[PDB]
């Protein structure tokens, strides 16, 4: 018995069908936590998506569970240790999400830098009347781009920015080997230096206890006036309220984000919404967690999660297991 | 001192560079100068510094017999009758490189923004109705896509430079082939025009407006595109037939149109439309910018400088470094 909480490609149902009894959700809807939990009561397997939160109380109510196959990279809403305590494999997708998310993050950098939203609303209002000196903005040429985090998305973005004439630097918990540093023209800097010397700041790190509200009032206070911040990872890696305050005083030049604190279900004090004053600020650009919203990629993400689930159900160690 | 007419506001530093050599008739106030007013200022001028709003035809030159050089603060001189300039011994100069990169940057941004439904995505978040991830808002990435470039000069190349590592298959069609070193370097393959339009997931324009390129992207070429193909125009409005573009959008064949430029601003075109069609402005599968390709302020100051230096070379009797025409 396998529960799939959200819609997947028919080809994926067909790969699963001969090994598993499928309890599926082929709608564009997200079901309530209580319905998902009802479906998983006697389930051996769960295919889990971004809206899902799995904790000890969840696992306790589902004693037959052998594997959670997550169709995602950041498992921050899944209690890994609780999974391991109850003999449950926790599985993720380590690479397939990286490229479309990195593409979006560059696009958001450029869009934020060039006042794309405002520019577009201006043409659409039928007020455009040929060239004027207006909407002057920030490009990547001769700029300094700093990466917080240098794993999959950091590296993919660094690859993609090779021809953009920018100076690249990064801060991470784990250093790149210096060979890769030379080849990508990356300089490793301290976090303070990162925030003080970067015209663009691209966040590329997971959400965990140590990264929660890491990007706070203190780090923001170090930024060059007009610096641009882009968040393609997890909302709670920044203090959205400190981001707002930084924008209102004019020090932060722009915040663009694909992700929001309000999505981070594992948090007891999770905000119920994005602050209306952040939505209203002109120096912003937002997308609704579409980092990997390419259909062709979704198929492969679904397939990878499916493969992991079938491996676990066959007694094997899943290739992308997150626990041991 | 030779008299120099500047049609638009310029940075103070540029006044200081020019005032020692020329009498300046400036427009630092940016007040709307009518053709008739510009002619009045230029009637006994030895030089004009021209910008994107300027249009110079044979009748204009005729009325300005002292002119020796028109210094253009721009790349695309489609609005300046070069041949008429040459025949009257007036240098015409432009700015070959300073506009390239920021325009290339904008256009990749527009490609990604168009591909990923940025406008609608942002509206949804800003609406207050975001509830977290959903299996919707699906888009088109660059990885595994075929990107076709029409034109392969300064901007075409800056764009190709910027797409290295993006996992895309790169192809192009131009009036002149790229050298093989550069095709090898950038992974670019040369193909016919029609082939480019039939096999590209992204089509990125990178060509000037002239009599051969006018309305080149017409109903005929658009009828070849893969359904869902995305078209990006950072060049001139009129290399495209916006009406044929709109119909291709409404039909559902063309997946999207993004533009930094519009037919309505191509002033030398007697028959240009008076506006961008409201139905195109209202179409969901679009993304627009108001001719801000070069709008990075570090860059505008240098654009003005370049045009100013060229004027000065011309006035000193030199052949100006960035002359477009060639004089006997
Ligand atoms: N918006 C989306 O659609 C989307 C898609 C995929 C991933 N993500 C999120 O992005 C995060 C990162 O993605 P990835 O694939 O690059 O992950 P990754 O694990 O490959 O890279 C993480 C990087 O962050 C660094 N890091 C960890 N703790 C840090 C700290 N305290 N300070 C500074 N750096 C630290 C690591 O050293 C590593 O360099 C994921 O955890 C996920 O939550 C979002
Ligand atoms: N949006 C902006 O702010 C902005 C900024 C700079 C330039 N531009 C416009 O972009 C245009 C292109 O700029 P560039 O710097 O790349 O010019 P360029 O002269 O360096 O390159 C033009 C390219 O177009 C090709 N071409 C010419 N006629 C063609 C045809 N009939 N079919 C196919 N290809 C043809 C040429 O072979 C050349 O490769 C300029 O003429 C200008 O109008 C716009």
Alpha-carbon gap, residue A167 to A189, rounded angstroms? 13
Q: List strand residue ranges (DSSP E) for chain B, in order.
A: 3-6, 23-25, 47-50, 69-72, 91-93, 146-150, 169-173, 189-190, 202-205, 229-233, 254-259, 286-288
Which residue out of B53, B79, B151 has the highest number of ligand 2 atoms within 8 Å of its CB and is therefore the one to mutate?
Answer: B151
CA angle B145, B239, B163 (to 5 degrees): 30
Resolution (Å) of this entry: 2.3
Burial status of residue A81 (CB atoms within 10 A of its CB: 0-12, 13-18, 19 or more): exposed
Domain A1-94+292-324 part of CATH 3.40.50.720 = yes
- The fourth-level CATH superfamily of domain B97-293 is NAD(P)-binding Rossmann-like Domain (3.40.50.720)
Q: Can you state the percent helix, strand and coil of chain B, rounding each to 5?
A: 35, 15, 50
Q: Is A153 in the pocket of ligand 1 (CB under 6 A)?
A: yes
Of B53, B132, B165, the CB nearest to A50: B132
| Distance (Å, whole) CA A259 – CA A286 | 8
- CB atoms under 10 Å from CB of A67, counted, come to 25
Q: Is B309 helix (H, G, I), strand (E, B) or coil?
A: helix
Q: Which atom of ligand 2 is nearest to the CA of B152?
A: 39
Rounded Cα gap, residues B225 and B191, in angstroms: 15
Report which of A148, A132, A143, A152 is spatially closest to residue A110, judged by C-alpha positions: A143
How many Å apart are CA B275 and CA A134, to the nearest integer?
A: 19
Q: In sequence order, which residues have a C-beta less than 8 Å from that of residue B228 and are 6 or more positions away?
A: B140, B201, B255
Strands B146-150 and B69-72: unpaired
A290 to chain B: nearest residue by CA?
Answer: B137
- Interchain CB contacts (distance < 8 Å): A and B: 199
CATH domain A95-291 topology: Rossmann fold (3.40.50)
For residue A230, list its beta bridge partners: A202, A256
Residue B201 tokens, joined: 């997931």
For chain B, domain boundaries: 1-96+294-328, 97-293
Output the CA angle A24-A45-A81, nearest 5 degrees.
Answer: 130
CATH class in words for B1-96+294-328? alpha beta
Mutation for testing the B interface, residue in A128, A161, A260 having most B CBs under 10 Å: A128
Q: Ligand 2 pocket, B239 CB below 6 A? A: no
Burial of B6 (0-12, 13-18, 19+ CB in 10 A): buried
Q: For residue B205, report the phi and psi dihedrals to the nearest 5 degrees.
A: -80, 145
B263 is catalytic: no
Of the partner residues A49, A138, A290, the one whose CB lies closest to the CB of residue B116: A290
User: Rounded CA gap, B77 and A14, in Å?
Assistant: 59
| Burial of B273 (C-beta count, 10 Å sphere; 0-12/13-18/19+) | middle
| Cβ B237 under 6 angstroms from ligand 2 | no
d(CA B280, CA B21) in angstroms, rounded, equals 48
- CB of A232 closer than 6 A to ligand 1? yes
Instruction: Give dist(CA A226, CA A200) in Å, integer.
Output: 9
Read off φ and ψ for residue A38, nearest 5 degrees.
-60, -45
- Asked if A1-94+292-324 and A95-291 have one fold, the answer is yes
Q: What is the DSSP-derived secondary structure letter of residue B232?
A: E
| Distance from Cα B10 to the centre of ligand 2, integer Å | 25
Chain B hits for A162, CB-CB cut-off 8 Å, are 164-165
Measure the CA dihedral A84/A89/A90/A95, to 10°.
140
């Amino acid at each position: 018995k396998l529960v799939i909480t959200h819609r997947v490609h028919e080809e994926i149902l067909q790969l699963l069908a001969p090994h598993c009894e499928l309890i599926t959700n082929q709608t564009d809807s997200t079901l309530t936590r209580e319905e998902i939990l009802r479906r998983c009561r006697d389930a051996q397997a769960m295919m889990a998506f971004m809206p899902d939160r799995v904790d000890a109380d969840f696992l306790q109510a589902c004693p037959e569970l052998r594997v959670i196959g997550c169709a995602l990279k950041g498992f921050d809403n899944f209690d890994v240790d609780a999974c391991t305590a109850r003999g449950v494999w926790l599985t993720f997708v380590p690479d397939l999400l990286t490229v479309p998310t990195a593409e979006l993050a560059i696009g958001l950098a450029v869009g934020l830098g060039r006042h794309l939203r405002a520019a577009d609303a201006f043409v659409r209002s039928g007020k455009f009347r040929g060239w004027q000196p207006r909407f002057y903005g920030t490009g990547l040429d001769n700029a300094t781009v700093g990466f917080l985090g240098m794993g999959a998305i950091g590296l993919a973005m660094a690859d993609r920015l090779q021809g953009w004439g920018a100076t690249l630097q990064y801060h991470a918990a784990k250093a790149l080997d210096t060979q890769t540093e030379q080849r990508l023209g990356l300089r490793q800097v301290a976090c303070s230096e990162l925030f003080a010397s970067s015209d663009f700041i691209l966040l590329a790190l997971p959400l965990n206890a140590d990264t929660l509200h890491l990007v706070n009032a203190e780090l923001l206070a170090l930024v060059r006036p007009g610096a641009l911040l882009v968040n393609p990872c997890r909302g709670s890696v920044v203090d959205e309220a400190a981001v707002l305050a930084a924008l209102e005083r004019g020090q932060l030049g722009g915040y663009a984000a694909d992700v929001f604190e309000m999505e981070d279900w594992a948090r007891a004090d999770r905000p119920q919404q994005i602050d209306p004053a952040l939505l209203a600020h002109p120096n912003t650009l937002f997308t609704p967690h579409i980092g990997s919203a390419v259909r062709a990629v979704a198929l492969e993400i679904e397939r990878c999660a499916a493969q992991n689930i079938l491996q676990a159900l066959a007694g094997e160690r899943p290739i992308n297991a997150v626990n041991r």
